[PDB]
Amino acid sequence: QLTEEQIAEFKEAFSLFDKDGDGTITTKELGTVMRSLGQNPTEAELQDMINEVDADGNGTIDFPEFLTMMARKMKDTDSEEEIREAFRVFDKDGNGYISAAELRHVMTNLGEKLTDEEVDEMIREADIDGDGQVNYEGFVQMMTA
């Protein structure tokens, strides 16, 4: 039930990396997402990231090869920090709140075109106090419940 939920979230995350929707993640797709979120991975780094989880050596990541990789992760001493790093990526103006415009910008980077209604619904799900923006607590609770 919690595992059912978790696999669906993992499939969603997979689908967000899979920009072209062909059912596999390429090094180019990983690089495009990482750059769009600000970063600068090297070619050597992108290739390493694939090469560790690429169990059949075809050079791309299919969902089992992504799903196994989530099956390795454990709750650790950097678990809460990891969520905080992600929050900081969404919060583009650094005011401590995720606005609708910030959320929409992230989703567009992840190959998703959301309607106004879809972005609103996402804010509503995470917006605890109903002020129309998402605080850090809102964000953390998303990944707890």
Binding site: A8, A86, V106
Partner: peptide, 19 residues
């Protein structure tokens, strides 16, 4: 479109993409 699932998926993607 599941708003909850989508937001959790995007956070996980962001976590992976940033470590």
């Amino acid at each position: 479109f599941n708003a909850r699932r989508k937001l959790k998926g995007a956070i996980l993607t962001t976590m992976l993409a940033t470590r």
